[PDB]
Every structure is written in structure tokens, then in C-alpha cells.
Write a protein that binds this ligand. Structure first.
Ligand SMILES: CCc1noc2cc(OC)c(NS(=O)(=O)c3ccccc3OC)cc12
Length: 131
């Protein structure tokens, strides 16, 4: 391991009692449809939890990525009704993807994984119900 255990940041928050939130049918769909389908995809597993820079030997990760996001966080945010609207959640997915494409080079296996999840994401977003 390039770096000691403990060198991960605290994960992104999944609750914030003073943050405004609302349940919308669009947020319900984000959980029930979008998250559940990407979650069980064969390429999801690197995205199901915060990047463990220690375990995975990416000691530079949190030098480069200052706004981390992952689908474990997003799943928790949806289940806990953290969001005010669908857009704040979509923002989280886009942040997760962009981080991957910033950190890695095009064609790297991790990027092909993210690209495939992103394709499916965008397909499922396409059918977002009207509020
Ligand atoms: C969002 C998770 C992530 N973003 O960028 C990464 C780069 C990684 O190692 C190259 C790893 N390491 S890994 O063992 O989880 C891994 C996953 C898929 C393909 C290759 C790979 O490690 C070489 C993870 C990420």
C-alpha cells in the first residue's frame, strides 16, 4: 500500500437536518428505477462506495478530486430523502462520472465502466416522469 490506512476523507454527508428537502415522484423514480438499475449492473461495483484511496492505492486521488461522489452516497441520500429536487441528485451522478474522467485516462477500464453506466443513466433519465 502506497499510503497508510486513515488517509481517506470523511465521506460526503447523507443527512443534514437543516437542509431543505421534498419527496417528489421524480426523486422516487431516481431511486426506484435509475439507482436500482445502475446499482446491479456488472460495472457498478467501483461506484458503490466512496473511493478508498488506501485500499486501492490511489494515494493521489483526494489531491486531484476535491468533490468526491459515489452511488453509495447517492443511494443513502435518496433513501433518507436528502434532496430538494431531482436536479440536485442528477448533479451528484454527474459529479461522480466527471471525477472518474478527470482522474483516469480515456480507454482505461474504470473509464469504460463509468461510460457504460453513464449511457444507461442518461437513457433512464430520458424517461424521468413529469413532476
Ligand atoms: C470511482 C472508482 C475509481 N475511480 O478511478 C479509479 C481508479 C482505480 O484504479 C485505477 C480504481 N481502482 S479499482 O480496483 O477499484 C479498479 C476498478 C475497475 C477497473 C480497474 C481498477 O483498478 C486498477 C478505482 C477508481
Amino acid at each position: 500500500h502506497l499510503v497508510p490506512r486513515g488517509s481517506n476523507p470523511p465521506p460526503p454527508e447523507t443527512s443534514n437536518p437543516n437542509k431543505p428537502k421534498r419527496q417528489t415522484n421524480q426523486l422516487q423514480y431516481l431511486l426506484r428505477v435509475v439507482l436500482k438499475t445502475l446499482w446491479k449492473h456488472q460495472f457498478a461495483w467501483p461506484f458503490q462506495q466512496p473511493v478508498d484511496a488506501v485500499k486501492l492505492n490511489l494515494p493521489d486521488y483526494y489531491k486531484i478530486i476535491k468533490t468526491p461522489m459515489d452511488m453509495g452516497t447517492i443511494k443513502k441520500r435518496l433513501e433518507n430523502n436528502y434532496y430538494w429536487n431531482a436536479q440536485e441528485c442528477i448533479q451528484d451522478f454527474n459529479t461522480m462520472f466527471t471525477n472518474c474522467y478527470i482522474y483516469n485516462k480515456p480507454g482505461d477500464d474504470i473509464v469504460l465502466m463509468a461510460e457504460a453506466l453513464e449511457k444507461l443513466f442518461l437513457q433512464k433519465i430520458n424517461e424521468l416522469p413529469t413532476e
